[PDB]
């Protein structure tokens, strides 16, 4: 399963007995390069191999008779941990309101319907909220998806205030006894201050319990910078990684976790409402390294 590059780096060192510190640094340099190829941000990839270095030495890799096995195990182990360790799903309570936030076209509208269907199946009574008034047909988009998964959709009006939104949502959720409110917000640049302000004010007024950063698996080096800005300017609580049905390696997930420390709750694995899975750190660790 391992990548061409890493098959060589570790293969080199098998059967040689003990290895030198130079051999370690040479290896860690190849792991670094491999992570950058897997779209891990370059500062994060630097820090990641420095973490590996400490752990490998803390396993006395210099004295080991199978040090290439030690190194490779420690990469697999450190990357799994850095991606969250074990599968972790959100903890729901009696009242639940979540935002879906992020960059343009990352999969927020589609993911909202996926979550609605997922939680419907678990006795939740979701409400979808079409809060994107700019993207053409965006409200019809979520309405059609809502109809497919058998979940109601509240559609925000043009120029409607957050206060008026809170009001109509509180009203419908109560009158319909709905305990999972899914707010689909428009994609925006992390540097677009008025729109990042709009999102912070919407958070301020609506008080979501979760704010899910929807991140496309093919996102490159800006992932760090994007995750940081959303979390500083708005405050993120969790992550959804989309388009994992592609062949992008998904290194942006490590960048996002590195700078935010937030869990990656879900994976998106198709265009259809069924295409949702719990996220498994180990599974993506393998993907990044393969």
């Amino acid at each position: 399963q391992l990548s061409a590059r890493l098959q060589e780096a570790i293969g080199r060192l098998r059967g040689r007995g003990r290895i030198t510190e130079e051999d370690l640094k040479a290896t860690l340099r190849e792991i670094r390069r491999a992570l950058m190829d897997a779209d891990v941000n370059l500062e994060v990839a630097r820090d990641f191999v420095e973490r590996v270095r400490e752990e490998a030495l803390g396993k006395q890799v210099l004295e080991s008779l199978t040090p290439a096995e030690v190194i490779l195990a420690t990469v697999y182990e450190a990357l799994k941990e850095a991606l969250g360790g074990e599968a972790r799903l959100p903890v729901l309570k009696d009242r639940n309101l979540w935002f879906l936030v992020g960059l343009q076209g990352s999969g927020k509208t589609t993911t909202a319907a996926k979550l609605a269907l997922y939680y419907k199946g678990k006795g939740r009574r979701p409400l979808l909220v079409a809060a994107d008034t700019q993207r053409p047909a965006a409200r019809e988009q979520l309405r059609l998806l809502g109809e497919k998964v058998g979940v109601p959709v509240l559609e925000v009006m043009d120029g409607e205030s957050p206060e008026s939104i809170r009001r109509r949502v509180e009203e419908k959720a109560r009158l319909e006894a709905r305990d999972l409110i899914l707010v689909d917000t428009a994609g925006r640049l992390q540097i677009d201050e008025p729109l990042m302000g709009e999102l912070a004010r919407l958070k301020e007024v609506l008080g979501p319990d979760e704010v899910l950063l929807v991140l496309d698996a093919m996102t490159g080096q800006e992932a760090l910078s994007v995750a940081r800005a959303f979390d500083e300017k708005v405050g993120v609580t969790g992550l959804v990684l989309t388009k994992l049905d592609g062949d992008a390696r998904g290194g942006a997930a490590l960048s996002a976790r590195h700078v935010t420390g937030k869990p990656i709750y879900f994976a998106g694995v198709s265009e259809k409402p069924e295409g949702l899975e719990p996220f498994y750190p180990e599974r993506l660790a393998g993907r990044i390294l393969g």
Partner: protein
């Protein structure tokens, strides 16, 4: 920024980290740095800019006039009447077609849209809304209709009406899905079935935030349908669209336009120099 005028080693070290942060990739970054190191020039700034602009140029004449110390723009003309727009999910294909329509209606062309995303919820309606806003006729069908059949009807309608340009939208698809790539191929043939000369342009849409997967997108779509052009969207963001360097280097597909917003005017013809400048900013 990159501290030009610093010692050689610090300049090259910063340039490496710049290209890598710009998503240019390990391979291409290595390519560029070896030759900048080899060609040994004091004017590192001018030497790098020349080479980068050089990959992103299918044309030595502009470089010739540049280095002769002479400068002209000139609007992008598609080679034929049908432009087929392709790429993966959420990259900006529909939004970009609307921008092209605004761009060409401003040059006085008769433009038609084919709303060929018959898969995604409101996939066709979305382009329909843009057609209304720009007063551009839109050929569309119900969700689930064969996009090849629709593409066919759209070329036929374009021909019947004496229109200059037809932009065929297509549903976003991942390049790992062979059946969707074959469907894409089938849409292309449907076009040629209505007019053998067409499509003269096949334009890939590429999102600027995309890292190294963008090269795999370009290779795989190229193989399926033959790219003639590439549009890079969301360049109004912090990302630099660096994966274009490996794309143009390896495939030699020209960059047609850049997308810099969510409105209809937020399109510009590609400027290799303004791009390289921003890349190293």
């Amino acid at each position: 920024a990159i501290p030009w005028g610093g010692n050689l080693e610090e300049v090259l070290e910063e340039l490496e980290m710049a290209l890598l942060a710009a998503d240019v990739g390990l391979s291409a970054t290595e390519e560029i740095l070896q030759e900048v190191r080899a060609s040994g020039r004091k004017d590192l700034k001018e030497a790098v800019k020349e080479k980068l602009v050089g990959m992103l140029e299918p044309d030595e004449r502009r470089a010739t006039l540049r280095k002769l110390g002479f400068q002209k723009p000139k609007p992008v003309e598609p080679k034929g009447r049908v432009v087929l727009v392709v790429g993966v999910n959420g990259v900006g294909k529909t939004t970009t077609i609307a921008k092209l329509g605004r761009y060409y209606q401003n040059l006085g062309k008769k433009v038609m849209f084919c709303a060929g995303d018959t898969f995604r919820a409101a996939g066709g309606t979305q382009l329909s809304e843009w057609g209304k806003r720009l007063s551009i006729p839109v050929i569309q069908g119900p969700e689930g209709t064969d996009p090849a059949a629709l593409a066919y009807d759209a070329v036929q309608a374009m021909k019947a009406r004496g229109y200059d340009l037809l932009f065929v939208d297509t549903a976003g698809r991942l390049h790992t899905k062979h059946n969707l790539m074959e469907e894409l191929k089938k849409v292309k043939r449907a076009i040629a079935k209505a007019d053998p000369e067409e499509p003269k342009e096949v334009w890939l849409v590429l999102d600027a935030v995309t890292g190294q997967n963008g090269l795999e997108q370009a290779k795989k779509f190229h193989e399926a349908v033959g790219l003639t052009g590439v549009i890079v969207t969301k360049l109004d963001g912090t990302a630099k669209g660096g994966v274009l360097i490996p794309i143009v280097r390896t495939l030699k597909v020209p960059i047609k336009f850049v997308g810099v917003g969510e409105g209809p005017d937020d399109l510009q013809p590609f400027d290799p120099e303004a791009f390289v400048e921003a890349l190293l900013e």
